[PDB]
RNA sequence: UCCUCCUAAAGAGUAACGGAGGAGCACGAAGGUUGGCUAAUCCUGGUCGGACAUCAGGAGGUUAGUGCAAUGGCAUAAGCC
RNA sequence: CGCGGGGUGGAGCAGCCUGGUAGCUCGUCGGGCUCAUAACCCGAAGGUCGUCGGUUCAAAUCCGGCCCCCGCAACCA
RNA sequence: CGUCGUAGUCCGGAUUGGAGUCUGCAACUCGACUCCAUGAAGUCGGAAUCGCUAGUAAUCGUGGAUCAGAAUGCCACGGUG
């Protein structure tokens, strides 16, 4: 709601980029939490935003 | 004064109510917000998110009295 | 280190000779010391503590453990889980073995030393042994300089009256007053 | 004067009477009155015939009353048309049937409510008068 | 180690943390030093275990803080019960000192801040 | 009533396990016993058990509160299940933790045949 | 425009500038899950202590809490560790 | 009609909105400069923050009531 | 010479009871001296301003007057300068 998107690179190839909306407001650390991409299908992890 | 609006549109009702055809699935009870008025006894049991008691097998309702003094269940016939 | 060898031979259970009880679940028993130390103001100094971490288990036989508040905002200013004091808890022989230094070396500092009042008593004659702050003990580097803080102790009974409760004073003395 | 404690909610709706309900019991003391017929009364009714009954009565008793307002009524401007709206709250009422005793009595013997009521009936609805203990 | 101070202040002369305090006084407090070995001139720190024995053997001579601040309070407030000129001064916040509360009360009165 | 949190503890089991029916195994446990019965495929009676009551184990047993007087328990349950051929049987342990002598007797009833 | 309790008729949607209120967001944690835990409030007593301060005992409990509103529920806890 | 503000130790207003918290310039009395009061520099005492409640850990402020004031204003059968 | 610090202090002992000592119808109230005890204030100090030219300022003791029974005020004396 009203916040900022920014989309969460992955470390190895992949064609999905997971978009953040993640507040950084009162916290500036980094968002790692592995999503599903049904190609490679092994999990991806996705890093760097907000 | 005014604007007290409720808005439009709401029902959830009548779908608990007598004898079952005994051959599909069934919410049982679709009494609004339910956390502990009612619950599910037997084979059956429903967990969903708008707090319906579906049975997830085909069966007719038991329409129950056990059940501590106003705590009664959604439970399945034995036919 | 002894009191546990002569409250298993006869005190409070030679009574058992003369009175009607068939087991020591009818007589009085001491088994415990809920022990705590408060750390009041410590917020406004916030420095003095963060090094005397086990200066609780300097007079207790078990590990040193900084409890934390169950209240976030107070009147007296505290934080979400600031630490509140140290417990420190005697239970059974490490009980025993503390109670061999209340009344019989704990002179150093007095108030009343004649029995004071019998505070916290339960009806079943709860005995207080508390020193208001601490007066220390003779054991490592002991005889220099060193602040202390508030100590008070109540020794608890499983009698139903102190018409029974007081059979313990019957077997040691300690001053003692209504 | 009487004034009710204000109202959890701004205003109320006056509602229907049944022109009944059985009331005759008398539980804060032995005798009382007779309604046996159904209307609405008012504060000052009330206020008007406990005006009546203490300048007859001076300080006996005291004399204990069942009936309390129960609803203010909204009031508004005369000239306003019909539709909107409601006004602000301005008198406060209550209803009144057959079974109802009103007052409550015991201890003031014979000078209230036991040759007559003409008095205190003058000040209110439905023609009422004094009721006789019942014992048996 | 200590046997009636309370203060934080090392290595001092055996009479400032000794004598003078809370109900000890100073004119029998001082000479039983010598028999536990200790000097009252210059610094010292030979007080500890063993020394202090001779020292926790005085027992029912005197009385000390809140039972000698009793036997003060009771008897005046014997006194804050009766007509008396010094009852009525210490049942209200009045001076005893033979004051003039046209000029100096200023210990009585407080501030002046 | 700490003997009533493990109650509360078999009220959430028994809740969990009535939606299975079925044939049912319940472990019970005291610091001088242990015990297990299997219960029937309508719920009203019991089929086979073995307890620390008996004197095959309570004669040869110094202690039956023993860890070896479980693992006792343990496998002579699931000999009588192999004389009863049950399968598919859904495990209670009566509001008590699985870990100590309910592990100890699972352990070894799984070292006297099928799991278990 | 959306949303609760009620009007709304012991079958359902629902009127009149009808009654009590809210929503345009929040939380990457306040999400998932295993096992546990159980309020609140008040009384008792414990140096530095104006004043609510500690840890333990007693009474006591669908009365604590629930991201926010109104409502229904609550330990098989959906409340917190 | 309808709309928008103000009410703050005695006087008149900042403060509020942005929560970690009661004020300024005068006034009153007492000083300092003086022969003396003003001008001027200091010292001291006192807030139902109109006022009853609500809400919150927490205010005068969030917010409903019960009163007192002003500005735009009566520009429609 | 011995001893001590930036600490409301070794100190101070101002205050508050209890004992006494003196003089005197009489010291309760308004007097002085003493002792066992307890115990607070003072670490330059408001806007702003005060005063003289050398034994002068600065500073410490000694004496007398009043007087049944007390001054720190009154009048004088010398030392350091």
Redesign the pocket.
Same mark, same amino acid.
Do not use: C, M, W
């Given at each position: 709601?009203?916040?900022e998107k920014i989309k969460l690179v992955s470390s190895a190839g992949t064609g999905h980029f997971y978009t !953040?909306t993640?507040?950084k407001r !009162?916290?500036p650390?980094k968002?790692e939490?592995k999503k599903f991409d049904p190609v490679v299908r092994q999990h991806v992890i996705y890093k760097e935003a907000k | 004064?005014?604007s007290?609006?409720?808005?439009?549109?709401?029902?959830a009702?009548?779908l608990g109510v007598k004898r079952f055809g005994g051959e599909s699935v069934l919410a049982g009870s679709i009494i609004?917000?339910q956390?502990?008025?009612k619950?599910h006894a037997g084979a059956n049991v429903g967990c969903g998110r708008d707090?319906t008691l579906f049975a997830k097998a085909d069966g007719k309702v038991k329409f129950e009295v056990k059940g501590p003094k106003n705590?009664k269940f959604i439970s399945i016939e034995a036919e | 280190a002894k009191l546990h060898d002569y409250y298993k031979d006869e005190v409070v259970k030679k009574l058992m000779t003369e009175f009607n009880y068939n087991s020591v679940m009818q007589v009085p028993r001491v088994e415990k010391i809920?022990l705590?130390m408060?750390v009041?103001?410590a917020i406004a100094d916030k420095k003095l503590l963060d090094n005397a971490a086990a200066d609780l288990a300097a007079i207790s036989g078990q590990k040193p453990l900084i409890?934390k508040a169950?209240?976030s905002?107070?009147?007296?200013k505290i934080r979400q889980g600031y630490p509140?004091?140290c417990?420190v808890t005697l239970r059974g022989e490490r009980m025993w073995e503390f109670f061999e230094r209340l009344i019989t070396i704990a002179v150093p500092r007095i108030r009343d030393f004649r029995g004071l009042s019998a505070?916290?008593f339960?009806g079943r004659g709860n005995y207080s042994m508390?020193v208001?702050?601490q007066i220390i003990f003779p054991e490592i580097d002991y005889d220099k300089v060193d602040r202390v803080?508030?100590l008070?102790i109540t020794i608890t009974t499983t009698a139903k009256s102190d018409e029974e409760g007081r059979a313990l004073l019957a077997a040691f003395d300690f001053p003692f007053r209504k | 004067m009487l004034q009710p404690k204000?109202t959890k909610?701004?205003?109320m709706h006056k509602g229907r009477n049944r022109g009944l309900a059985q009331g005759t019991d008398v539980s804060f003391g032995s005798f009382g009155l007779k309604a046996v017929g159904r209307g609405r009364l008012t504060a000052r009714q009330i206020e008007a015939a406990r005006r009546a009954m203490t300048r007859a009565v001076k300080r006996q008793g005291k004399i204990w009353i069942r009936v309390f307002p129960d609803k203010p009524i909204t009031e508004k401007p005369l000239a306003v048309r019909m539709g909107?709206?409601?006004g602000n709250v301005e008198y406060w009422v209550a209803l009144i049937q057959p079974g109802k005793v009103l007052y409550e009595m015991d201890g003031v013997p014979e000078e209230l409510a036991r040759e007559a009521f003409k008095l205190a009936a003058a000040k209110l609805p439905i023609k009422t008068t004094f009721v006789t203990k019942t014992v048996m | 180690a200590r046997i009636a101070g309370i203060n934080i202040?090392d290595h001092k002369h055996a009479?400032?943390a000794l004598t003078?305090?809370?109900?000890?006084?100073?004119?029998?407090?001082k000479a039983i030093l010598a028999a536990a070995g200790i000097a009252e001139?210059?610094?010292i720190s030979e007080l500890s275990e063993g020394q202090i024995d001779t020292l926790r053997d005085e027992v029912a001579k005197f009385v000390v803080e809140g039972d000698?601040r009793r036997e003060?309070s009771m008897?005046?407030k014997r006194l804050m019960d009766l007509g008396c000129?010094?009852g009525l001064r210490?049942r209200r916040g009045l001076?005893?000192?033979?004051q003039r509360t046209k000029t100096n009360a200023r210990?009585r009165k407080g501030p002046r801040? | 009533d700490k003997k009533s949190?493990r109650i509360?503890?078999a009220?959430?089991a028994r809740?969990k396990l009535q939606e299975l029916g079925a044939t049912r195994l319940v472990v019970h446990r005291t610091p001088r016993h242990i015990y297990a019965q299997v219960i029937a495929p309508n719920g009203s009676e019991v089929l086979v058990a073995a307890s620390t009551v008996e004197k095959a184990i309570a004669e040869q047993l110094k202690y039956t509160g023993n860890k070896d007087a479980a693992a006792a328990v343990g496998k002579a349950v699931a000999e009588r299940a192999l004389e009863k051929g049950i399968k598919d049987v859904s495990f209670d342990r009566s509001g008590f933790?699985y870990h100590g002598r309910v592990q100890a007797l699972a352990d070894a009833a799984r070292e006297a045949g099928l799991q278990f």
């Open positions: 709601g009203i916040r !953040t993640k507040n !009162t916290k650390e968002l939490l | 004064g005014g007290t609006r409720n808005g439009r549109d709401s029902e009702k009548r609004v917000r956390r502990g008025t619950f707090h705590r | 809920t705590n408060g009041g103001e409890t169950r209240k905002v107070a009147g007296f509140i004091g417990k505070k916290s339960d508390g208001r702050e803080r508030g008070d | 204000r909610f701004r205003k909107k709206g409601k | 202040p009479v400032i003078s305090i809370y109900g000890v006084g100073k004119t029998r407090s001139d210059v610094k000698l003060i008897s005046i000129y010094r210490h001076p005893v000192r033979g210990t801040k | 949190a509360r503890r009220t959430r809740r933790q």
